[PDB]
């Protein structure tokens, strides 16, 4: 097949895409070896949706598992009454999810379960895959003549041909796995045909983050999680936490091979060490450099002339309320916390008013790094550890170090009941959730 492996795409058809999945557990060939793995479409990842605004979704999903399961429409600015963190699809039962996708809208999104308490052994197994909206602005030269691929990022690790299981420091640190993996393969080999390639990158991870670069090459930013930025940004390296989702331009600059590498990054992660007498937490540092694929350019590469324009930012109305949500951890407890509290199902904790814009201050207290994602309402970040952000885009997923403070702009849409959460989803089994309600 193609040497670079991509999911399948599934396109809607004449405005409807109309999919039956069922979420199961599936005997795969995986990074060399043979596993059963959860899957949606029986594959790993699963297969990506491809849609344009004002296309017609409808997706039944079948449960095949032992255990209930949803899905979460990550990104998706639609109603929580479709997006629903509550609803629960017992084994054996189905549900069909139907929305219109809005118009005003592009980029790299993704499905995964939301089952609070059951996300983080369900994500982790290989239940997720991605949906891209197709943009009016795919069409501009820039873009229509790059080479495309989309690059999900998510590792696994594996025990008896299985996933392996959740030991107690898993659900305190958010569990990370020994095969770091695109697409599911094991570092894959991209053979560009063209100079300028159109990389859409998803973190579908559980707690995993990778610190990306391209050897001797920059990247280009041109979206961030839900949609363009209004110009392309160079950056030297580009880190995704779990849930994130950015697309870049490379500009291959001359002949050979390129690694992209998730490069060392100390989020924070704690392990346990006994020098005589007490037995402590320690933290683990940085990650181990991993390669994530090969990237090959082509015969005396001249890379197109970058878009000098993406799409205008929306002027936002001025903000009627400013919440503060500060992030603690208990982590010999392995229990999170927003506000001090754990979620609830049945406790509302912020009560906003649709249409109205309004700005989130969330605090990190905690000294691991937690990407905050909010449903339902994407965002605008101002700032994160008083650094004022240096691009406007919509993002639903902002990443916390240790004791920063992000500002969000956070334009209230559909009305209903929706949750924010950290995105290492184990956090958000372990309680760090809270409730918003729009009305
Ligand atoms: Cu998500
Ligand atoms: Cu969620
Ligand atoms: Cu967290």
Redesign the pocket.
Known sequence: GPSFPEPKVVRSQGGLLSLKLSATPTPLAIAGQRATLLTYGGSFPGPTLRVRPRDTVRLTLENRLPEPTNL?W??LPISPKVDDPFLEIPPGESWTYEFTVPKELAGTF?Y?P?LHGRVAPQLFAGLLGALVVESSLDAIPELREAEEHLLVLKDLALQGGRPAPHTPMDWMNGKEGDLVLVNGALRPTLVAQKATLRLRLLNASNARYYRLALQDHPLYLIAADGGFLEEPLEVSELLLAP?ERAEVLVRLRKEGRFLLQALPYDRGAMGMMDMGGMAHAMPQGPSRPETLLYLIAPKNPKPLPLPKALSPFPTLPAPVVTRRLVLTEDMMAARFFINGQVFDHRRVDLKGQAQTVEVWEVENQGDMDHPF?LHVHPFQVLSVGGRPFPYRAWKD?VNLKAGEVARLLVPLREKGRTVFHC?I?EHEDRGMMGVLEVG
């Open positions: 979460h990550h990104g993704w995964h939301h849930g994602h997923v995105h989803v």
